[PDB]
Symmetry: C2
Subunit: 145 residues, 2 copies
């Protein structure tokens, strides 16, 4: 059973004075099997690359996330970064409606469509379940070599 993980990773990059951090979406049966995909998703230096937090995402806005190898869809998963507090994940039909829904959850941004991840398609099903967007785990976990 493949799972979708939102992963927050940290490391160095050439030119930079401090540690940088990025959010990756990866798919695997477990976290350790996503390690190759985390490493190649990471833009910076591989030496010292570490996991800071992650969450297995199964539900967003009442929608269950399904993953299939093959897969038309009405609504899609959108990740919205504000230039877990500084980002969100929403379900919407358009990139513009995704940004607006993201603005309304607080009380010019950038968004990514999460629809194809490590050769797996993201399809959504309404079922009513909520999932708090909080880490399953946080800390400092270096990836192996």
């Amino acid at each position: 059973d493949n799972k979708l993980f939102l992963v927050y990773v940290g490391g160095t990059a050439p030119g930079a004075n401090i540690e940088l951090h990025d959010i990756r979406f990866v798919v695997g049966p477990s976290m350790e099997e996503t390690y190759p995909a985390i490493r190649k998703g990471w833009f910076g230096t591989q030496k010292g690359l570490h996991l800071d937090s992650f969450v297995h995402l199964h539900h967003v806005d009442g929608y269950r996330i399904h993953l299939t190898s093959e897969a038309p869809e009405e609504k899609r998963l959108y990740f919205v970064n504000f230039g877990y507090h500084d980002f969100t994940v929403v379900v919407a039909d358009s990139p513009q409606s995704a940004k607006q829904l993201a603005r309304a959850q607080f009380s010019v941004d950038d968004c990514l469509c999460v629809d194809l991840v490590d050769n797996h398609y993201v399809t959504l099903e309404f079922d009513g379940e909520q999932q708090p967007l909080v880490p399953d785990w946080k800390g400092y976990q270096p990836l192996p070599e």
Copy 2:
């Protein structure tokens, strides 16, 4: 009269999903006169680069910072990155080893950088006993011009 600024800048880089941030050290008479050096020190994509916070750094651990065109110093300025400015500090030390030690002790494997040459200006230190809190002069969102 040149000033040493520590600037917190933000923007994008190829392959990254979110906005990234770096700390730069820059030298100029004013903040706006450091913009070329900020742009050329930024590791990522130029388009959309913005300044988020900065501080004019004049004193660290009782030492006054002097900036000169021409340059032996026993103690030096060290910037220490830990693995509001909470995730890092600046200290005065003789060696990178002792720099890391002093940085650890003032909270209650890391990386450190020696800040002795910045934009063709040498950093020299003079003990005068003055303190300066390592906090921003300004914070917000300021796009750098093109």
